[PDB]
């Protein structure tokens, strides 16, 4: 009932990582800020963002949202591979069909939240993952991963943000801000900066919305006494760097021992680290890690913090722990395996 508002990059391209920063200002109930959108009308169509599901403030139900529509070219189901502790996966229907993950998340007005999605190929399927950085708390969280049963799909086209009223409370104002929009290109793994974006009301004949920019962010609002100062829409440019500011992967190894024919290797990322994408461990029979490993543990997931494995090992082994973050930064540590360690 409030008119929709779309904020669209001028220069987006097919991507495997998409990122934007968002801050809520006015939060009417029944508002979805879908900060990422992809593949509309197409294979692996989806979106993700933030909702005010009820109430006008922090005492209402505030959530993250993530949905992918059912495959066109397969009868196989989308799987919810991982959901965070405050996340719930369910099948949606009556609006096409597909999978959504709704996550209770206590986001706050005038604070910034970075939503970063990554898509990757694995096992002949495509995975889509949702990560969120609470900027004020300097903390990343893995929210959910969907396993889509079609290969070679990406965030191919259609990058945009919308603010929408889904229930019909047009008297109530909704307003938010965005900045730091970036994609990682499929073509060359370089970053594209969405420094120029267009703000445009959904209904050309409805001016009950507004938008603009400061030096730091784009802002938009709709509903109530909102009235456009920019006609049907306008393009704005932010002074963001051509390259995104990417943190560092940093972790502590917490165990590395072998006892009673069980190998246990675990770690904890620092609270200030970029989030874990994947891990691998190679076990060598020698300190220099020459030759072939005697054992390899592959495909440790984003949501796994190490291994416990029934295994036979000789006396003097060494572990090569190779962790990679969601930005493909790798940090490798070598650790001597403590033979007997509860002991």
């Amino acid at each position: 009932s409030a008119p929709g508002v779309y904020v669209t990059p001028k220069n987006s391209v097919s991507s495997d990582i998409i990122s934007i920063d968002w801050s809520p200002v006015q939060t009417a109930p029944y508002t979805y800020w879908a900060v990422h959108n992809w593949n509309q009308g197409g294979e692996a169509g989806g979106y993700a963002g933030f909702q005010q599901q009820s109430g006008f403030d922090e005492n209402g139900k505030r959530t993250l949202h993530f949905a992918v529509w059912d495959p066109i070219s397969s009868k196989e189901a989308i799987k919810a591979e991982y959901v965070s502790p405050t996340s719930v996966a369910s099948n949606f229907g009556g609006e096409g069909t597909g999978l959504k993950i709704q996550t209770t998340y206590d986001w706050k007005n005038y604070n910034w939240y970075r939503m970063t999605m990554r898509s990757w190929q694995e096992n002949g399927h495509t995975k889509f993952g949702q990560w969120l950085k609470d900027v004020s708390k300097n903390q990343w969280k893995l929210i959910g991963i969907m396993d889509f049963p079609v290969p070679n799909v990406t965030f191919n086209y259609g990058q945009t943000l919308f603010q929408a009223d889904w229930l019909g409370n047009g008297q109530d104002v909704r307003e938010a801000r965005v900045k730091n929009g970036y994609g990682r290109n499929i073509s060359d793994k370089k970053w594209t900066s969405w420094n120029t974006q267009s703000i445009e009301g959904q209904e050309p004949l409805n001016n009950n919305w507004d938008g603009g920019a400061t030096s730091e962010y784009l802002w938009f609002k709709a509903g109530g006494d909102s009235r456009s100062t920019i006609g049907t829409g306008k393009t704005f440019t932010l002074n963001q760097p051509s390259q995104p500011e990417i943190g560092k992967l940093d972790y502590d190894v917490k165990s590395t021992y072998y006892e009673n024919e069980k190998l246990n290797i675990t770690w904890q990322l620092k609270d200030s680290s970029t989030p874990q994408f994947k891990g691998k461990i190679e076990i060598y029979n020698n300190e220099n890690m020459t030759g072939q490993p005697i054992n390899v543990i592959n495909d440790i997931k984003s949501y796994q913090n190490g291994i416990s494995q029934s295994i036979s090992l000789p006396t003097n082994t060494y572990a090569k722990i190779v962790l990679t973050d969601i930005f493909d930064q790798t940090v490798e540590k070598k650790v001597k395996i403590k033979n007997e360690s509860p002991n």
Binding site: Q40, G41, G45, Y47, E95, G158, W166
Partner: peptide, 9 residues
């Protein structure tokens, strides 16, 4: 209940 999108026009 529904949270729609648009296809390209």
């Amino acid at each position: 209940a529904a949270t729609t999108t648009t296809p390209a026009p």
